[PDB]
């Protein structure tokens, strides 16, 4: 049972509204900074003793850290901004959100009805805008549809496939006052009628008979398996089907398991990519068959039999043509799938052992591996010490480009949601806002922001919010003065051509530029810098046991490549494993 | 006679083809990021000796920074992102520019074009998220049309009412080998045939004979006379006719001459207000009746005969209703103003000097004011010291809030294109990146930033632009500890209710947070901080007299507001003025 | 050609749509609200100061009465044939002007739009601004309906009469009485008339008879009426045109009148599209 804090005929401002309506969805945590159109809002918010604000230094930092919040937790992620300026700043994580399915509720404030239309000020036609990279957005145009539109937002971006959904607030509705019907139902007639309904055993026996035809099977996972980990647990426990998991998917299969081939993709393992090209069996689930996995679509498991389930029936067929799919959600499937697999468990004689075999042979002779130059600092060797120290159980938001990839390949998460980083958008500046929503959502975890200087610096503002609201966000600074993955890319295509991809100062070149510690210095965060391999170990162990927030400046040689790598466009046959740029 | 790298009948790169396009409409500056989806574009900009790059460290950085290169030169601004987080990046300078009517042309790289629409890496429909906040923009979808598209963009972005336009180029077009045809034809034919002619002779007789007839006469200027200057000054001396201008106008007529009423509006001085309300004829040149300088409309210049003149003709009767009006180049009707008021010079008797003294005895009872206490810093008084020492002959960037009214307030712009500032829109984080932009266009310029601690943080990164690309450019960074302009409206409409307007720490809330020196020292940037007024002079002239980039750090209290104010929707008899928050 | 048009005038604009002040045109003077309210309190204004004020244009008026003798609206009689100008000339008179008039489009439109005085607004119901072939029957059945006592008569086209032949069914079971003046040129005369001055004159699918029968008309419009049983004639001599009209007017309930017309006729005078008033042209057609 709700307490409202009003009377149930008590005329309140429809700001008052619109915060209680938030509050009967359970929010706890608010990312909002405040502005003309959007003060009512804030002011309601104040009134509000179960729900927090995280005051940003930048609203983009309010989107990351909202995605990061949702992406640690489940929950959706809230994130308030005023008009115009506020509004347009949110948009690099609303296509993020979008890209990645993460759900995601934004409120921006707007200027009155009458004003809109008329170039007013601080005015963005924010929901023209930003049609087209949410799952759905709103402009409400009265005070009484505020808990339909709230109730419909939260449901539309939790439910099905998870996405960003905006609400548009004009000052005028917010200033209105009225008595709210909580009880109103949701005009959604057409999307809740194509909900996927549960799978069908028809359905799950057929992928069952495909699994005991086959010699070879692989599982694709993404990042549709996210809360399925118990249950794909138990399903590879049954069958002994080895597992690749996209970026999107870490941890959904435990890493560190000897059944897990890891990543594939254009810079996943080759066992992994060798598994899924001489496949005859292809179990692909919650994922979307994105072309840094499948490279030449023509021969991405040319052999398989392909079966996808997905929650989004325009993702079944659209690149990869499946032989057998369900749509639906992954998790029930898999708990069919469970209950056939135990009952007929000895009528199944599975045992892919030559099959795993054949792999763990791959394994063998092409590892995961990295050089060490004399006393300089490996980004690789960096992760694999974070992970022994933090005994793989910390949560891991990076930024993006080279030491996003290394910190994907090098460090072995156990359970999903340790991972926030942004795959299908790719958006630099996303780790330490990330992180900071991440630390918000799990206080007692472990959260440390894998971050290269490149991505670093673009959002280093939210330092300040760190800081100020006290959290224990660790800052893993992998610094190599450039943009790193796009220098690699001039080495490989470009014949090592430099075209703008040095971030440090020319005047001084050997001189690392700029000074990270002091931008830690001007928020109060404890800081200091490692050069020599040999001192890592200590240096890394000092921010884990220094009590709250902290950066650690990891100088690295800017000279290494992220190995392997399968060319944009390219087959098995296409991939890279030695070389960087000495 | 344009020279070009390439032969006549030598097939060169999209990339190159788009680089000597931009040769070819002038352009010495760029200001891009790289990026995955516009490499191609990166290495042919190596290749060009006579475009220069300036590497920002945010895109949002880079957009404004080609703002602030436009406002403070003439010339189209050029900025350059990739895909995706690149694009996104770049919205609210669009926008920006948009509302503000700057000359912008936008570069994004893109996705192949099979790859469109298919949620492809890194891919985000930006021609559509963009189209509402653009003056147009493109998809280029063949090589041979790079040629006509870019001269279109420059053409549409500089000729009649100026603003942004974006232009997105898919990678494969970028590599695709071609040869260009420069003599193309514009496709612009509706456009064309709907630019106005130049003014009509009826037209201006017109204005000159309601000018004789009337004995209160004020001028309203705006952004649309930053190029009539010598125009408008003439002009005046004619009419003997009073001026007072817009936020976006400052400086089209010199601020410190006897017939300036300066800055009119919701901040504007009670004298301007007073003039135009009470005037009989309103003479409206490059302007656009918003708001912020109308309050209630009905009440805006009752008594006045208005006369518009506005190149734009969706402008002309939108919001208040002329009187007479003319749709062209406000420098070209007040050149034919000129040659009649001049040739009719003694035939018309012009003599408004009781009604310049009676807006002068208005200028003595109600002048602009601040109050002084103890040995704490008025930032008004800052900024007037500001001016002394510079000569009022600097150029000013802002940022938004109370420090970016009292800079319009109390600085005495002689030259329009001093004044660089986000009027429209008025998005934070505007004033350092524009600084950048303005030191890149005017090298031997004093270029200073007037910055607030919550705008300035915003873009911090772009610290680093400064120092790497060593350029002179001062922050004069006014320091209150918090969201000023909020805190404001806090103060006289929410009873000084506080909802997220503290920007420093809790925890030590007498401590100015954060230390925005070491965010300086962190980019190698000399810096200080003063508290006391009295070592306020010494300060201000160490940061000019000191070679190459400085911040000074001037700590005011934060009691103080913006003086005098009309509220939102209001009438001059609404205006308040005495007051803070003590 | 905008820039032609009214060249000497200081031009005052009053219209309710502030998108429309300014668009092509650039007013001196203008009001953005109800032209109704305007002329209001300008006569109120007009008759207090009105002798304070002199106004005469009466030399501005004979100036144009003047061009009103020299150059009238006209049409030439060619034998026993019929003018489709003195047809609805001859409405005119009949229906003493307060006649209510729907139209198609095409010639025969802007005849109906010359040669007919109306007397009072919403006589005159025609499609102008998009021009729509097959208008004129089915406006003519909703103004019988708003207008039951009134004289309600369609001047069609038989191109545009054929485009929505089938409301004639609809006027017989409603019972309206639906007067049809059809002016039947075997054509699509407006675009006839644009072949002969400007592509020689060369046909290219203007004619709507058949060309196995090209002296019979085709199709017969008054057994589309008899389907519908609606009483019809046709009138081919100029004089007994007169009486046709008359029995059709006289005779109550819906009737259709097929009036037989030279199509070699054209519509004057006219000015070419984008052209000015020295462009005129008076005289002409297609014989
Ligand atoms: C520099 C860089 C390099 C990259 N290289 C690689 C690489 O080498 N390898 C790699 O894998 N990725 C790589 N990516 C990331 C890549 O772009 C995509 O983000 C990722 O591959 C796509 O993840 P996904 O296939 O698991 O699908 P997701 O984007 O995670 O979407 C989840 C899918 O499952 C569905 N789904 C959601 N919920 C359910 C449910 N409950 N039941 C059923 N279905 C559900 C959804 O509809 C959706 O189709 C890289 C990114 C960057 C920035
Ligand atoms: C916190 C804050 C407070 C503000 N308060 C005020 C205030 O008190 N007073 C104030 O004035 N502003 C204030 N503003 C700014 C305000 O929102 C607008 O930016 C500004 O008032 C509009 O400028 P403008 O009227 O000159 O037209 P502009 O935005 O500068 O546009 C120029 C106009 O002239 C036309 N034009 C352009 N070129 C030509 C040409 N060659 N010939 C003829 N016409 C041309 C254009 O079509 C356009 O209509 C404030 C902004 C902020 C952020
Ligand atoms: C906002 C933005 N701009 C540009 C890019 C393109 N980009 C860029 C410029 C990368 C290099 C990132 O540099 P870094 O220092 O943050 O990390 P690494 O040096 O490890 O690559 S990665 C990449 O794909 C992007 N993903 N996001
Ligand atoms: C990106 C953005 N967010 C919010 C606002 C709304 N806003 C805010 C939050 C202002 C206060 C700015 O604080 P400041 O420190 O930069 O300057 P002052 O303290 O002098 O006001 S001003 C204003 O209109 C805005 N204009 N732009
Ligand atoms: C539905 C439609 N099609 C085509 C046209 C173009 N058009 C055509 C084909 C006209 C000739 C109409 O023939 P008509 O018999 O109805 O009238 P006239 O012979 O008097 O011109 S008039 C004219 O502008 C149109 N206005 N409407
Ligand atoms: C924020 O912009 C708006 O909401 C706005 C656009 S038009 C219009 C009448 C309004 S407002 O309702 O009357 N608030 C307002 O002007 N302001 N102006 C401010 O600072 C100048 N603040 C803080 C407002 O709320
Ligand atoms: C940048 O994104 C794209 O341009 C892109 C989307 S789909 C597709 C086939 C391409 S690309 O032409 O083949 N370049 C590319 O993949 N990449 N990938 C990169 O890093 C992973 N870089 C730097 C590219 O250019
Ligand atoms: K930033
Ligand atoms: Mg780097
Ligand atoms: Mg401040
Ligand atoms: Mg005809």
Request: hydrophobic share 40%.
């Given at each position: 049972?709700?307490?409202?804090?009003?009377?149930?005929?008590?005329?309140?401002?429809?700001?008052?509204?619109?915060?209680?309506?938030?509050?009967?969805?359970?929010?706890?945590?608010?990312?909002?900074?405040?502005?003309?159109?959007?003060?009512?809002?804030?002011?309601?918010?104040?009134?509000?003793?179960?729900?927090?604000?995280?005051?940003?230094?930048?609203?983009?930092?309010?989107?990351?850290?909202?995605?990061?919040?949702?992406?640690?937790?489940?929950?959706?992620?809230?994130?308030?901004?005023?008009?115009?300026?506020?509004?347009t700043?949110?948009?690099?994580?609303?296509?993020?959100?979008?890209?990645?399915?993460?759900?995601?509720?934004?409120?921006?404030?707007?200027?009155?009805?009458?004003?809109?239309?008329?170039?007013?000020?601080?005015?963005?036609?924010?929901?023209?805008?930003?049609?087209?990279?949410?799952?759905?957005?709103?402009?409400?145009?009265?005070?009484?549809?505020?808990?339909?539109?709230?109730?419909?937002?939260?449901?539309?971006?939790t439910?099905?496939?998870?996405?960003?959904?905006?609400?548009?607030?004009?000052?005028?509705?917010?200033?209105?006052?009225?008595?709210?019907?909580?009880?109103?139902?949701?005009?959604?007639?057409?999307?809740m009628?194509?909900?996927?309904?549960?799978?069908?055993?028809?359905?799950?026996?057929?992928?069952?008979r495909?699994?005991?035809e086959?010699?070879?099977?692989?599982?694709?996972?993404?990042?549709?398996?996210?809360?399925?980990?118990?249950?794909?647990?138990?399903?590879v426990?049954?069958?002994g089907?080895?597992?690749?998991?996209?970026?999107?998917?870490?941890?959904?299969?435990?890493?560190?398991?000897?059944?897990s081939?890891?990543?594939?993709?254009?810079?996943?393992?080759?066992?992994?990519?060798?598994?899924?090209?001489?496949?005859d069996?292809?179990?692909?689930?919650?994922?979307?068959?994105?072309?840094?996995?499948?490279?030449?679509?023509?021969?991405?498991?040319?052999?398989?039999?392909?079966?996808?389930?997905?929650?989004?029936?325009?993702?079944?067929?659209?690149?990869?043509?499946?032989?057998?799919?369900?749509?639906?959600?992954?998790?029930?499937?898999?708990?069919?799938?469970?209950?056939?697999?135990?009952?007929?468990?000895?009528?199944?004689?599975?045992?892919?052992?030559?099959?795993?075999?054949?792999?763990?042979?791959?394994?063998?002779?092409?590892?995961?591996?990295?050089?060490?130059?004399?006393?300089?600092?490996?980004?690789?060797?960096?992760?694999?010490?974070?992970?022994?120290?933090?005994?793989?159980?910390?949560?891991?938001?990076?930024?993006?480009?080279?030491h996003?990839?290394?910190?994907?390949?090098?460090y072995?998460?156990?359970?999903?949601r340790?991972?926030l980083?942004s795959?299908?958008?790719?958006?630099?500046?996303?780790?330490?806002?990330?992180?900071?929503?991440?630390?918000?959502?799990?206080?007692?975890?472990?959260?440390?922001?894998?971050?290269?200087?490149?991505?670093?610096?673009?959002?280093?503002?939210?330092?300040?919010?760190?800081?100020?609201?006290?959290?224990?966000?660790?800052?893993?600074?992998?610094?190599?003065?450039?943009?790193?993955?796009?220098?690699?890319?001039?080495?490989?295509?470009?014949?090592?051509?430099?075209?703008?991809?040095?971030?440090?100062?020319?005047?001084?070149?050997?001189?690392?530029?700029?000074?990270?510690?002091?931008?830690?210095?001007?928020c109060?965060?404890?800081?200091?810098?490692?050069?020599?391999?040999?001192?890592?170990?200590?240096?890394?162990?000092?921010?884990?046991?220094?009590?709250?927030?902290?950066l650690?400046?990891?100088?690295?040689?800017?000279?290494?490549?992220?190995?392997?790598?399968?060319?944009?466009?390219?087959?098995?046959?296409?991939?890279?494993?030695?070389?960087?740029?000495?």
């Amino acid at each position: 049972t709700f307490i409202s804090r009003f009377a149930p005929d008590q005329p309140r401002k429809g700001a008052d509204i619109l915060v209680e309506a938030l509050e009967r969805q359970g929010v706890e945590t608010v990312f909002a900074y405040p502005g003309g159109a959007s003060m009512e809002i804030h002011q309601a918010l104040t009134r509000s003793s179960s729900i927090r604000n995280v005051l940003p230094r930048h609203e983009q930092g309010g989107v990351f850290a909202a995605e990061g919040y949702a992406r640690s937790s489940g929950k959706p992620g809230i994130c308030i901004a005023t008009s115009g300026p506020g509004a347009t700043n949110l948009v690099s994580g609303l296509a993020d959100a979008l890209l990645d399915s993460v759900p995601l509720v934004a409120i921006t404030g707007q200027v009155p009805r009458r004003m809109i239309g008329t170039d007013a000020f601080q005015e963005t036609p924010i929901v023209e805008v930003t049609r087209s990279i949410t799952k759905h957005n709103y402009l409400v145009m009265d005070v009484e549809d505020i808990p339909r539109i709230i109730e419909e937002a939260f449901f539309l971006a939790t439910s099905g496939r998870p996405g960003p959904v905006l609400v548009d607030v004009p000052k005028d509705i917010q200033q209105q006052l009225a008595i709210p019907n909580w009880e109103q139902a949701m005009r959604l007639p057409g999307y809740m009628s194509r909900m996927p309904k549960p799978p069908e055993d028809s359905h799950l026996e057929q992928i069952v008979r495909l699994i005991s035809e086959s010699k070879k099977p692989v599982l694709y996972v993404g990042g549709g398996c996210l809360n399925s980990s118990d249950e794909l647990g138990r399903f590879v426990e049954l069958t002994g089907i080895p597992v690749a998991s996209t970026l999107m998917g870490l941890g959904s299969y435990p890493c560190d398991d000897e059944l897990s081939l890891h990543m594939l993709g254009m810079h996943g393992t080759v066992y992994a990519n060798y598994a899924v090209e001489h496949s005859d069996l292809l179990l692909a689930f919650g994922v979307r068959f994105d072309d840094r996995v499948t490279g030449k679509l023509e021969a991405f498991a040319s052999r398989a039999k392909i079966v996808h389930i997905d929650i989004d029936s325009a993702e079944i067929g659209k690149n990869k043509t499946p032989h057998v799919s369900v749509c639906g959600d992954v998790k029930l499937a898999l708990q069919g799938m469970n209950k056939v697999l135990e009952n007929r468990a000895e009528e199944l004689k599975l045992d892919f052992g030559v099959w795993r075999n054949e792999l763990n042979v791959q394994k063998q002779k092409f590892p995961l591996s990295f050089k060490t130059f004399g006393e300089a600092i490996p980004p690789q060797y960096a992760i694999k010490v974070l992970d022994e120290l933090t005994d793989g159980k910390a949560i891991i938001s990076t930024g993006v480009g080279q030491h996003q990839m290394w910190a994907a390949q090098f460090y072995n998460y156990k359970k999903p949601r340790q991972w926030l980083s942004s795959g299908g958008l790719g958006a630099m500046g996303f780790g330490l806002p990330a992180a900071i929503g991440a630390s918000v959502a799990n206080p007692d975890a472990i959260v440390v922001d894998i971050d290269g200087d490149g991505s670093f610096i673009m959002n280093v503002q939210e330092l300040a919010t760190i800081r100020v609201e006290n959290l224990p966000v660790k800052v893993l600074l992998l610094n190599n003065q450039h943009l790193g993955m796009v220098m690699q890319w001039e080495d490989r295509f470009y014949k090592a051509n430099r075209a703008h991809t040095f971030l440090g100062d020319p005047a001084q070149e050997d001189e690392i530029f700029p000074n990270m510690l002091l931008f830690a210095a001007a928020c109060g965060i404890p800081a200091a810098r490692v050069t020599k391999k040999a001192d890592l170990r200590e240096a890394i162990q000092t921010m884990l046991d220094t009590p709250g927030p902290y950066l650690l400046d990891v100088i690295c040689p800017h000279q290494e490549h992220v190995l392997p790598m399968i060319p944009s466009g390219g087959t098995f046959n296409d991939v890279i494993t030695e070389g960087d740029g000495r």
